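Inputs:
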Amino acid sequence: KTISFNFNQFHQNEEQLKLQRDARISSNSVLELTKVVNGVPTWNSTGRALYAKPVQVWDSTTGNVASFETRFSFSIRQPFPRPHPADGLVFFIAPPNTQTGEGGGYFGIYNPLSPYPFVAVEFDTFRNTWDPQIPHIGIDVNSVISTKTVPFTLDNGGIANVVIKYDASTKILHVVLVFPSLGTIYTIADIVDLKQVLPESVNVGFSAATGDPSGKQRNATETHDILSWSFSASLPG
Amino acid sequence: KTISFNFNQFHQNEEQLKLQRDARISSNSVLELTKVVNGVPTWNSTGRALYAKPVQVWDSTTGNVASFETRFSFSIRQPFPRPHPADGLVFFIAPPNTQTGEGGGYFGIYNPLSPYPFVAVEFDTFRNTWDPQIPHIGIDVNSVISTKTVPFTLDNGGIANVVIKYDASTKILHVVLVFPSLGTIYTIADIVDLKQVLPESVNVGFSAATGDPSGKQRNATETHDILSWSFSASLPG
Ligand SMILES: *[C@@H]1O[C@H](CO)[C@@H](O[C@@H]2O[C@H](CO)[C@@H](O[C@@H]3O[C@H](CO)[C@@H](O)[C@H](O)[C@@H]3O)[C@H](O)[C@H]2NC(C)=O)[C@H](O[C@@H]2O[C@@H](C)[C@@H](O)[C@@H](O)[C@@H]2O)[C@H]1NC(C)=O
Ligand SMILES: *[C@@H]1O[C@H](CO)[C@@H](O[C@@H]2O[C@H](CO)[C@@H](O[C@@H]3O[C@H](CO)[C@@H](O)[C@H](O)[C@@H]3O)[C@H](O)[C@H]2NC(C)=O)[C@H](O[C@@H]2O[C@@H](C)[C@@H](O)[C@@H](O)[C@@H]2O)[C@H]1NC(C)=O
Ligand SMILES: *[C@@H]1O[C@H](CO)[C@@H](O[C@@H]2O[C@H](CO)[C@@H](O)[C@H](O)[C@H]2NC(C)=O)[C@H](O[C@@H]2O[C@@H](C)[C@@H](O)[C@@H](O)[C@@H]2O)[C@H]1NC(C)=O
Ligand SMILES: *[C@@H]1O[C@H](CO)[C@@H](O[C@H]2O[C@H](CO)[C@@H](O)[C@H](O)[C@H]2NC(C)=O)[C@H](O[C@@H]2O[C@@H](C)[C@@H](O)[C@@H](O)[C@@H]2O)[C@H]1NC(C)=O
Ligand SMILES: OC[C@H]1O[C@H](O[C@@H]2[C@@H](O)[C@@H](O)O[C@H](CO)[C@@H]2O)[C@H](O)[C@@H](O)[C@H]1O
Ligand SMILES: OC[C@H]1O[C@H](O[C@@H]2[C@@H](O)[C@@H](O)O[C@H](CO)[C@@H]2O)[C@H](O)[C@@H](O)[C@H]1O
Ligand SMILES: [Ca+2]
Ligand SMILES: [Ca+2]
Ligand SMILES: [Mn+2]
Ligand SMILES: [Mn+2]
C-alpha cells in the first residue's frame, strides 16, 4: 500500500517525531537539528529527527521495492565566514531504532564503532579529507564517502527547496536542489538498490552536525533548520 | 574534449544557429520556434533550431560516451483555452543534417517515411492517442511514445527553467522543470544508452509544432519560445 505524511510546519512536542541529541523544535515552528543559543549556532552540536513510525521499503514475500518521493525546505545560515563553516545536513534512511552516530563530517549517521547500513543525501559544507570542494550535494550509501557529488553555491540564510525521488523500477535516486531567491537549480542522480542495502523496514529522517571540538575552531558552525517536510511511499506488495 | 556554448538571448541571423521552417528570432531577442503573427500564434506551424556545429557524443575508437548538461528557459502562452492547445516543444539530439519531420504530435522530429534515431525531452501539451494526461514531460527514444512521463501544470505565459543532465557512467538522463513564479518543481529520469541509439556525431536543438490542419481546429495553437540556452559536453576520449 501507500504510506505518507506531511508537516507544513512543526509543533513543539511532535508526537510524530523522534528528536535525538541536540535536535529541537523552536517556538516559531522550525525544526532546528543543531544547537542555536540566543540566535547563534554553536559548535560541537549533533542532532537528528526521525519519523516516529517505521516504513516498509521492500517486502521479502513479493520481492517488490517501494518507490518514494520526499520534499523539504531547509535553511543553512553561516554567521562566521572564516575559517570554515561545518558540517552540513543529510536526509537519510536507516534501520529502525538506531542511535546517533559520530558528529562532525559524519553528520551523526555513521558510527565507526558498530556501523549500520544507510542511504543518505548530504548537503556538505565542510571539506573533510575524503571530500571534493564544498559545498556539495552527495549520495551516500553505507558511508560518507559519496558515490556521486555535485557542487552548489549556498544561499546563506536563504531557503532551499529539495526534491528527492526514488523510482524502484529503474533504481534511480534523483535529487533536485533549488534556491528560489537566486533561481539556481542543482541536480544529481545515481543508481541505488535499496533492497540490497537496507532491511524491509526503516526510519526516515534528518541529521546534522556542527564543528567537532578536535578541529579547535568554535566558528566551525552554522544552523541546520528544516522548515517543512512531506513524504510519500508506494509498495505494491 | 569539452564543447560548450551559451546564449543569454538570441540575435537576428545568429551564425551559431540553424533555423528551419517557421523558426525565427524576434527583434526583442527571443527564439520563436513556431509562427506568431501580430502577437497571435497560428496553427499549422512547425519550426526547429539547431546548434550550427555537430557535437561528438561518443567515440568509436575508445568506446567512451560523453556526459552533458543543458539548461534553457522557455515560455508557452496559450491564448485560446478551448478546445485544446497544441502541440508542444522538445529538446532533441539527432544525426546531423536532418530535415524537419512531421508536425503536430510528432513535434517536427519524427519523419515516418525516413525515420532517423533521436533522443528527446518533450513538453507535450496535446493528448494524442498514444499520450497520457497533458501537459506532461516525456523522455523519447526514437519515438514519440515516451519511455517515461510525468504530469505538470503549465504557467501560462510564464517562464520555465529546464535542466537536462546526462551522466555517461550511469546512463541516467535526468530532467528538472521549474516554474519560478509558481515555485513548482517537476522531475523525471530514465536510463538511456546514447551509444546504442545515436551515431558518434549529432546535432542538438529544439523543435515545436502547433495544431495540425487535420484536427480542423485553428485554436489548436500556442507559442513555443526559447529565451536562453546553454550547453556543455565532455568526452573523456
Ligand atoms: C571567528 O569568527 C568571528 C566572527 O566573525 C571572527 O571575528 C571577527 O573578525 C573580523 C575580521 O575579519 C572582525 O571584523 C572587523 O570588524 C570591524 C567592525 O565590524 C571593522 O572595523 C574591521 O575592519 C573588520 O572588518 C570582527 O570584528 C570580528 N568579530 C568579533 C566581534 O569578534 C574571527 O576572526 C578572527 O578572530 C578574531 C578573534 C580576530 O582576531 C579577527 O581579527 C580574526 O580574523 C573568527 N576567527 C577565526 C578562527 O577566523
Ligand atoms: C476558438 O477560440 C476563440 C477565442 O477564444 C473562441 O471564441 C471565443 O469564445 C468564447 C466562448 O467561450 C467567448 O468568451 C466570452 O466572451 C464574452 C465577451 O468577450 C464574455 O462576456 C463571456 O464571459 C465569455 O468570456 C469569446 O468572446 C470568443 N472570442 C472571440 C472574440 O471570438 C472560439 O469559441 C467559439 O466561438 C465563439 C464565438 C462562441 O461561439 C463559442 O461558443 C465557440 O466555442 C474557439 N472555438 C472553438 C473551436 O472552441
Ligand atoms: C500549412 O502550411 C503549409 C506551409 O508550410 C502549407 O503548404 C504550403 O502552402 C503554400 C501556399 O498555400 C505553398 O506555396 C507551399 O508550396 C506549401 N508547402 C508545402 C508544405 O507543400 C499548407 O497548405 C497550404 O494551405 C492550404 C490551406 C491549401 O491552400 C494548400 O493548397 C496550401 O499548400 C498549410 N495547410 C493548410 C491546410 O492550411
Ligand atoms: C561537546 O559536547 C559534549 C556534550 O555531549 C560535552 O560533554 C558533555 O557530555 C559528556 C558525554 O556526553 C559528559 O561526560 C560531560 O559531562 C558533558 N559536559 C557538560 C557540558 O556538562 C563536551 O564538553 C567537554 O567534555 C566533557 C566530557 C567535559 O570534560 C567538559 O568539561 C568539556 O567541556 C563538549 N566539548 C567541548 C570542548 O565543548
Ligand atoms: O573544525 C571543524 C572540523 O573538525 C574536524 O576536522 C579535522 C580535525 O578532526 C583534525 O584532524 O584537524 C583537521 C585540521 O588539521 C580538521 O580540523 C572534523 O573532522 C570536521 O568534520 C569538522 O567538524
Ligand atoms: O487539433 C490539433 C491536433 O490535430 C491532430 O490530431 C488528430 C487529427 O489528426 C485527427 O486524427 O482527429 C483526431 C481527433 O479525432 C485528432 O484531432 C494532430 O495529430 C495533433 O497532434 C494535434 O495537432
Ligand atoms: Ca564534509
Ligand atoms: Ca502529444
Ligand atoms: Mn561530502
Ligand atoms: Mn507525449
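Residues 194-197 of chain B form the longest helix (4 residues). Flag for discussion at group meeting.
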